Amino acid sequence: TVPTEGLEVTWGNNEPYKYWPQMSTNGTAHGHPHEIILYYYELYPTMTVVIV
Amino acid sequence: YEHVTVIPNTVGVPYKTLVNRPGYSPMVLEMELQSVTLEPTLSLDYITCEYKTVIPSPYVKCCGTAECKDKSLPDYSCKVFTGVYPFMWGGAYCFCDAENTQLSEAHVEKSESCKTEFASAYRAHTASASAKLRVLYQGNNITVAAYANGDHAVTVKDAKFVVGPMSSAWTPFDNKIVVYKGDVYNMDYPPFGAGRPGQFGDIQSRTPESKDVYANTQLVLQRPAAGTVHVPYSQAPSGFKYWLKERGASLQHTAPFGCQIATNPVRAVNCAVGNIPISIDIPDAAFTRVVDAPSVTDMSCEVPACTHSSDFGGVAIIKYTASKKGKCAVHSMTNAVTIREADVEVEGNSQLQISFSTALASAEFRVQVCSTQVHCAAACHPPKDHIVNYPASHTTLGVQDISTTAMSWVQKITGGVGLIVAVAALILIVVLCVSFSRH
């Protein structure tokens, strides 16, 4: 798994690799109310549940 | 003219700052840093290495009694055995068949190999810091290097730069470290004169040139076998050889914050902590009066596309009319949007293009070109790429940064509930007042 801060991987005598996440959603911030909730939930799961 | 700014300690990311003074044209500078190094102060306690055992030829006295005296050599041992009857290839050695004795002795010395294969123990103290910086100034790339404190200044093209001090005192090294051929380990080594027979520190010396050596190995002499001339003994194995096979991973692989380690001298680089202030001094001759600079009088903005990805996924078109040929500086007036371009060339009546990146779902910002401003707005869509190989070029969002549609829904729901409460309160007040007054 890749955390927000990124992951470093090394194998054998080779050089390390670095990976960072990028934002992606299936919902939308525009349109019907129930589609808006999905958009934010996929990005900040913990805060979305507590606030609602 | 003095200017002060603060840049975060993020290697490989450019930042921009705006400098201006009333009556003169503004300037925009761009800065990017390449390396940061910390260096501790060390002191030596002792070194360790392998040991050697020295055993001379035994002395055998038949039909007489041997004795020996004490000596000051390290781990000296001496014993006398009775009842020996040695043989050689040609027959029994001495005429007497009884009352024979044998004398054995040994001691411990320091190995010759200690000049090449050894480890050293250090104590660590407060570290210094330095940095290397790149600056884009008046269309030219220049480089500077300075100490990360207030006691150094560098002058390039008649401008002075001062960097530091650093905002954080975090250091990846502990008080006690051990160094061996490029590896650095954190280990609470025992004090001088308190070693153990089979662990690290069984033999200690202050310096490779010393003659005084400490050791606390076990050494016991044993009875010889019948008919054989030899000196058996029992001794604990060397601790140094054991450590090499069990020492584990070094700090290069376990340290936090992505730090890297070097040993000649001991250093740590690229630790992503804190921020660094900078101060700049620009001479008066570098400024041009606004009466000579070009001007732009009429502008409008449109933004045909926006994707809020980690890269520059936005484009904008700006219309202008300019008074004469020349150059202008470009700068953003908000923190949530970064613009790649430093300057533009303007002539006549035409349009210019810029690119930007942002994390906002709905973006509004202002842009300044040659001391005048416009307002731009657009809606942005999400990307579809899960993983990338580079850090983002923009800042994070806050709790207030929500879309306009979401805000509208919030106001409607809150207002509805508030209204029904107010109506109920008004009914109670009239009833309570009338009942009081009617009596």
Ligand SMILES: *[C@@H]1O[C@H](CO)[C@@H](O)[C@H](O)[C@H]1NC(C)=O
């Ligand atoms: C969105 O739906 C697609 C459907 O193919 C799925 O693969 C993906 O895991 C879902 N979630 C995100 C964040 O894309």
Ligand SMILES: *[C@@H]1O[C@H](CO)[C@@H](O)[C@H](O)[C@H]1NC(C)=O
């Ligand atoms: C090279 O040998 C010298 C002494 O002969 C020693 O001090 C030094 O540590 C050695 N260098 C390496 C890299 O082993």
Ligand SMILES: *[C@@H]1O[C@H](CO)[C@@H](O)[C@H](O)[C@H]1NC(C)=O
């Ligand atoms: C040197 O300056 C040019 C602009 O004149 C710029 O495009 C280039 O990136 C600079 N060099 C580096 C290493 O950034």
